[PDB]
């Protein structure tokens, strides 16, 4: 149970988000049905008034939190991968029009899934924002947790791997476009029952051998990290 507080721009808080240039959904519980309109951005996917401005090549920081700003993030039973996706925001997030820029699933290097860092990290991950053309997009931010992924959810709905997802309202004002943004996959839909990493046993099985879901990071993508970038504590 998680939800964004706001985003960083070159370390800069750009303030509380929620229900601003946030799509913050109602409260902090899960989607889980994979063929669920809430895949998109969650239970509550609507314009608010706001969106970032970014420039191409900042350093744009997603800050998760629990119940209050900069506390536990995540319960740490939440063991799993963290993506980002890009959209142009005209698609609403419908379509074939979600690209992956980040993913970050088990390090086997620091023996520890991208939730785990992600609390360390006092919730944040980081982008770079891609070259992509100026307008206004929709960055989708995914933690998957996956301590009752063993079931799938469509066998028991109690149970399943359970979506974190939360739309952050973009503006790119200054990029060269040297890399345009493809054509992507659609939430719903990317994700199946069949899809790798969807349904996994964390108890059973080793996280040397999980395989995170596809769609894979883009060519484009320039990166980011799972890292403390902003201290809240100096506000
Ligand atoms: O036993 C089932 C799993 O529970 C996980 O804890 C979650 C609780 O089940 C869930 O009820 C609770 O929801 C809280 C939420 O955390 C809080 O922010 C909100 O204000 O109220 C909600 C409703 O009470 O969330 C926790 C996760 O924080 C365990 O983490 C897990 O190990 C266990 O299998
Ligand atoms: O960040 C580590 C993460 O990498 C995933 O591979 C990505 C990689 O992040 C990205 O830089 C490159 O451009 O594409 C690949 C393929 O999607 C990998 O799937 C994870 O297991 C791993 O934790
Ligand atoms: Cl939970
Ligand atoms: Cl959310
Ligand atoms: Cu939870």
Sequence with gaps: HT???????????QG???????????????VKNLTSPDMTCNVDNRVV???????????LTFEWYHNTR?????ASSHHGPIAVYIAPAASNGQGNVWVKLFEDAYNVTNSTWAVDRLITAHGQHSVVVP?????????????IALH??????SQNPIRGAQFYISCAQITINSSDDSTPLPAGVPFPGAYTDS???????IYTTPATSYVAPPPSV???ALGGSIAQVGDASLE
């Design 195 to 201: 899809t790798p990493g969807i349904q996994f046993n």
């Design 3 to 13: 939800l964004v507080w706001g985003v960083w721009v070159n370390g800069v808080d």
């Design 16 to 30: 509380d988000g929620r229900n601003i240039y946030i799509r913050s959904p109602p409260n902090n519980n899960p």
């Design 131 to 143: 070259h992509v053309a100026p307008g206004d997009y929709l960055f989708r931010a995914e933690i």
């Design 49 to 59: 008034p706001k969106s970032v401005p970014v420039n191409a090549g900042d350093t």
């Design 148 to 153: 009752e992924a063993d079931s799938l959810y």
């Design 218 to 220: 883009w060519s484009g």
């Design 70 to 74: 900069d506390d536990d993030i995540i």
